[PDB]
Design a protein around this motif. Structure first.
Motif, PDB file in Angstrom:
ATOM      1  N   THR A  79      46.109  41.668  42.558  1.00  0.00           N
ATOM      2  CA  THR A  79      45.214  42.570  42.515  1.00  0.00           C
ATOM      3  C   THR A  79      44.304  42.704  41.162  1.00  0.00           C
ATOM      4  OG1 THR A  79      46.647  43.868  43.737  1.00  0.00           O
ATOM      5  CG2 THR A  79      44.784  45.230  42.680  1.00  0.00           C
ATOM      6  N   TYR A  80      45.130  42.346  40.053  1.00  0.00           N
ATOM      7  CA  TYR A  80      44.255  42.230  38.835  1.00  0.00           C
ATOM      8  C   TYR A  80      43.296  41.062  38.920  1.00  0.00           C
ATOM      9  CZ  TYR A  80      43.797  40.404  34.138  1.00  0.00           C
ATOM     10  OH  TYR A  80      43.133  39.923  32.759  1.00  0.00           O
ATOM     11  N   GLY A 102      32.723  42.843  40.123  1.00  0.00           N
ATOM     12  CA  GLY A 102      31.380  43.054  39.451  1.00  0.00           C
ATOM     13  C   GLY A 102      31.504  44.700  38.699  1.00  0.00           C
ATOM     14  N   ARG A 103      32.535  45.253  38.671  1.00  0.00           N
ATOM     15  CA  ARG A 103      32.862  46.532  38.247  1.00  0.00           C
ATOM     16  C   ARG A 103      33.888  46.603  37.053  1.00  0.00           C
ATOM     17  NH1 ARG A 103      30.551  51.786  39.646  1.00  0.00           N
ATOM     18  NH2 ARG A 103      28.960  50.290  40.307  1.00  0.00           N
ATOM     19  N   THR A 104      33.816  45.494  36.243  1.00  0.00           N
ATOM     20  CA  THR A 104      34.918  45.704  35.200  1.00  0.00           C
ATOM     21  C   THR A 104      34.356  46.009  33.742  1.00  0.00           C
ATOM     22  OG1 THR A 104      34.423  43.238  34.371  1.00  0.00           O
ATOM     23  CG2 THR A 104      36.048  43.629  36.179  1.00  0.00           C
ATOM     24  N   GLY A 105      32.844  46.255  33.793  1.00  0.00           N
ATOM     25  CA  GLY A 105      32.479  46.767  32.552  1.00  0.00           C
ATOM     26  C   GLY A 105      32.137  48.479  32.688  1.00  0.00           C
ATOM     27  N   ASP A 125      41.770  39.930  41.395  1.00  0.00           N
ATOM     28  CA  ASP A 125      40.551  40.342  42.316  1.00  0.00           C
ATOM     29  C   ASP A 125      39.586  41.419  41.487  1.00  0.00           C
ATOM     30  OD1 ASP A 125      41.320  38.714  44.436  1.00  0.00           O
ATOM     31  OD2 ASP A 125      42.747  40.282  45.280  1.00  0.00           O
ATOM     32  N   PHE A 126      40.272  42.321  40.777  1.00  0.00           N
ATOM     33  CA  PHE A 126      39.641  43.354  40.069  1.00  0.00           C
ATOM     34  C   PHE A 126      38.820  42.402  39.029  1.00  0.00           C
ATOM     35  CE2 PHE A 126      39.160  46.163  36.002  1.00  0.00           C
ATOM     36  CZ  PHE A 126      38.555  46.936  36.594  1.00  0.00           C
TER      37      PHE A 126
END
Ligand SMILES: Nc1ncnc2c1ncn2[C@@H]1O[C@H](COP(=O)(O)OP(=O)(O)OP(=O)(O)O)[C@@H](O)[C@H]1O
Ligand SMILES: [Mg+2]
Lengths: 20, 336
Positions: free
Chosen positions: A2-3, A10-13, A5-6
């Protein structure tokens, strides 16, 4: 994992509030 | 806590009824550097000339506020910020406006966003997450007692002060309502299902948000994520949550009670209100009075090299704040 894939997504910022 | 809240409400009401206005002016500060940005504005580190103190100035372009239809929301933010007072809420030091912009000058919280530390480190240990979580629980109890709903909880909006404690910022979506409201606002990952379904919602969305926050702090990633907002909404609506292998049994149970689609079961809203959260096993080691009094040992204390240091914040492309010789949207922001 899961990490992985996260981290590859595109939404880690900084996320902004929704705006119409 | 009943007596405290009673006196705190009286203090709030006086300011909500008779808000302060025009307590400063642009030329009293030297603008230094951008600290952060959001959909509706940008926050800059500034230095107050006469005192020499540093502050964080939130600048809103009036025309952009209108275009994005955030007039009422911006008026909410300023009216609410100037009236509240709690150890974990950022302080509004001054407020004012000019021909082109709206300004909200807050105390500068040098530790940086929780967001930056969270993503760099990866994730917070449970005791670490619990320390921050306790502060948010108390802040929501305070806010909800004033009939206020926050609506934008997220690491990006939680600043760490010099003592290692949290300071909530950005009341852009904060609103004072008795009953329910319908605005589709917030940040995708943190929206409660009631919001997405357009059925009307109340303060309980803040408690669901707390669940998301605790999950993100402990896991390192949110409970519902995807590349596009719409894909995120589908996951939230489905509601099935998956927990990392390292989550304690107590954490997973608390979380199932917060990330709960059924309003008649979601903690914080029930009969016992906030006590269902405070008395939960996950919080057994928490001294609520000590936390409020700030006497607890902070697990993390940011590095700070004097006033004006912005090393705990990312860098942003600077933008010149525009001016105009003609007043814009005068009547719309009369009360600001
Ligand atoms: N008191 C403060 N001290 C230091 N930095 C701050 C302070 N208040 C805000 N910031 C910085 O500014 C950032 C965003 O500013 P702000 O919350 O005003 O934007 P916004 O347009 O309201 O955001 P949104 O996208 O949720 O609509 C924060 O995430 C933080 O980096
Ligand atoms: Mg923000």
């Amino acid at each position: 994992t899961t990490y992985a894939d996260f981290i590859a997504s595109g939404r880690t910022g900084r996320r902004n509030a929704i705006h119409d | 806590v009943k007596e405290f809240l009673a006196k705190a409400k009286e203090d709030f009401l006086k300011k909500w009824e008779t808000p302060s206005q025009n307590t400063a002016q642009l030329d009293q500060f030297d603008r230094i550097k951008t600290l952060g940005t959001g959909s509706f504005g940008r926050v800059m580190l500034v230095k107050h000339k006469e005192s020499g103190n540093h502050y964080a100035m939130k600048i809103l372009d009036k025309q952009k506020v209108v275009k994005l239809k955030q007039i009422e929301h911006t008026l909410n933010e300023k009216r609410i910020l100037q009236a509240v007072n709690f150890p974990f809420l950022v302080k509004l030091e001054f407020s004012f406006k000019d021909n082109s912009n709206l300004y909200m000058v807050m105390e500068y919280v040098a530790g940086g966003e929780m967001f930056s530390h969270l993503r760099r480190i990866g994730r917070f240990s449970e005791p670490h997450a619990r320390f921050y979580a306790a502060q948010i629980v108390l802040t929501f109890e305070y806010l909800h007692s004033l009939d206020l709903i926050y609506r934008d909880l997220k690491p990006e909006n939680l600043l760490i002060d010099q003592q290692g404690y949290i300071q909530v910022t950005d009341f852009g979506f904060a609103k004072r309502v008795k009953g329910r409201t319908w605005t589709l606002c917030g940040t995708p990952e943190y929206l409660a299902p009631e919001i997405i379904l357009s059925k009307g919602y109340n303060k309980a969305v803040d408690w669901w948000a707390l669940g998301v926050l605790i999950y993100e702090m402990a896991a390192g990633y949110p409970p519902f994520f995807a590349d596009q907002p719409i894909q995120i909404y589908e996951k939230i609506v489905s509601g099935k949550v998956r927990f990392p292998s390292h989550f304690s049994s107590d954490l997973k149970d608390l979380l199932r009670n917060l990330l709960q689609v059924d309003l008649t079961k979601r903690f914080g809203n029930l009969k016992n209100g906030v006590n269902d959260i405070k008395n939960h096993k996950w919080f057994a080691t928490t001294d609520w009075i000590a936390i409020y009094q700030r006497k607890v040992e902070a697990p993390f204390i940011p590095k700070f090299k004097g006033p004006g240091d912005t090393s705990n914040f990312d860098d942003y492309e600077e933008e010149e704040i525009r001016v105009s010789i003609n007043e814009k949207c005068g009547k719309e922001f009369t009360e600001f």
